[PDB]
Design a protein around this ligand. Structure first.
Ligand code: QQ4
Ligand code: U3A
Ligand code: MN
Ligand code: MN
Length: 182
C-alpha cells in the first residue's frame, strides 16, 4: 500500500542487500508486506544477520544454516540431518544445526528481557534437544545449559552489532515503536 516508509529506508541502508532480499522473500512467503510491517521487516533482517554472523563463528563446516531458505527446502534439510545423525526431528523449524555438538539451534533476538524471550521460546519448542540461544539489543545473552556454543569474541561481535542497530534506530526516532512492537 505505501510508497516507502522511514523504517524501510533505514532497513535498506542498514543491512546488506542479500539480507534485505531474504527478508522480503521470507515475509512474502508468509503473506507479509515489507512496506507495511516495517518493524517486522527490521526484525527479520536483524534475526537473519545474527544467524549469519553466528554461523560464521566456529570452524568451516560446523553449522548447517536452516534460516534464510524457503520453508519446504528448510524442512528438506532438517529431514536429511535427522536421518543422517539420528537426532530428534523438532516440531518447529530451527535456525542452525551444530555439526560439532550435534544439535539444532534456535536463535532469538529480543527487545525485552532475555529471560522473557527465553521462556517463550523454551515453552514452544518443548524438544529437550534443540539448543536455544537468545540475544538482546542491550548486550545480554542466554543459552541452554549455559552452553553458548561459540567463543566469547564471536558473541561479542553480535552484541556490538545489535547495539549499533539500536542506536541507529533511535537517532531516527524509530527505536521506541520498534521496541513496542515486539
Ligand atoms: C549459500 C548462499 C547464501 C548463504 C548466505 C551466507 C551469507 C554470508 C556471506 C559471507 C561469506 N560474507 C562475509 C563477508 C560479507 C559476506 O557476504 N554472510 C555472513 C555475514 C553476512 C553475509 O552475507 N553465506 C554462507 C555461505 C556463503 C554465503 O554466502 N545462504 C543463504 C541462506 C542459506 C545459506 O547458506 N545461498 C544458498 C542458496 C541460496 C543462496 O543465496
Ligand atoms: C514469517 C515467518 C518467518 C520465519 C519464521 N521462522 C523462524 O524460525 C523465526 N521467526 C522469527 C520471527 C517471527 C515473527 C516476527 C519476527 C521474527 C523475528 F525474530 F525473525 F524477527 N524469529 C525467530 O527467532 C525465528 O527463528 C519470517 C518472517 N515472517
Ligand atoms: Mn527462524
Ligand atoms: Mn530464530
Amino acid at each position: 500500500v505505501p510508497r516507502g516508509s522511514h523504517m524501510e529506508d533505514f532497513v535498506r541502508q542498514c543491512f546488506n542487500p542479500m539480507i534485505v532480499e531474504l527478508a522480503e522473500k521470507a515475509m512474502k512467503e508468509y503473506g507479509e508486506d515489507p512496506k507495511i510491517e516495517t518493524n517486522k521487516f527490521a526484525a527479520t533482517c536483524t534475526h537473519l544477520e545474527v544467524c549469519f554472523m553466528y554461523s560464521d563463528g566456529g570452524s568451516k563446516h560446523r553449522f548447517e544454516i536452516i534460516e534464510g531458505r524457503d520453508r519446504i527446502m528448510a524442512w528438506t534439510v532438517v529431514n536429511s540431518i535427522c536421518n543422517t545423525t539420528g537426532v530428534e526431528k523438532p516440531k518447529f523449524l530451527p535456525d542452525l544445526y551444530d555439526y560439532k555438538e550435534n544439535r539444532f539451534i534456535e536463535i532469538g533476538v529480543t527487545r525485552r528481557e532475555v529471560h522473557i524471550y527465553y521462556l517463550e521460546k523454551a515453552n514452544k519448542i518443548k524438544s529437550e534437544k534443540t539448543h536455544i540461544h537468545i540475544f538482546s539489543f542491550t548486550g545480554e545473552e542466554m543459552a541452554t545449559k549455559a552452553d553458548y556454543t561459540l567463543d566469547e569474541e564471536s558473541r561479542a561481535r553480535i552484541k556490538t552489532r545489535l547495539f549499533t542497530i539500536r542506536q541507529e534506530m533511535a537517532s531516527r526516532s524509530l527505536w521506541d515503536s520498534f521496541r513496542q512492537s515486539e
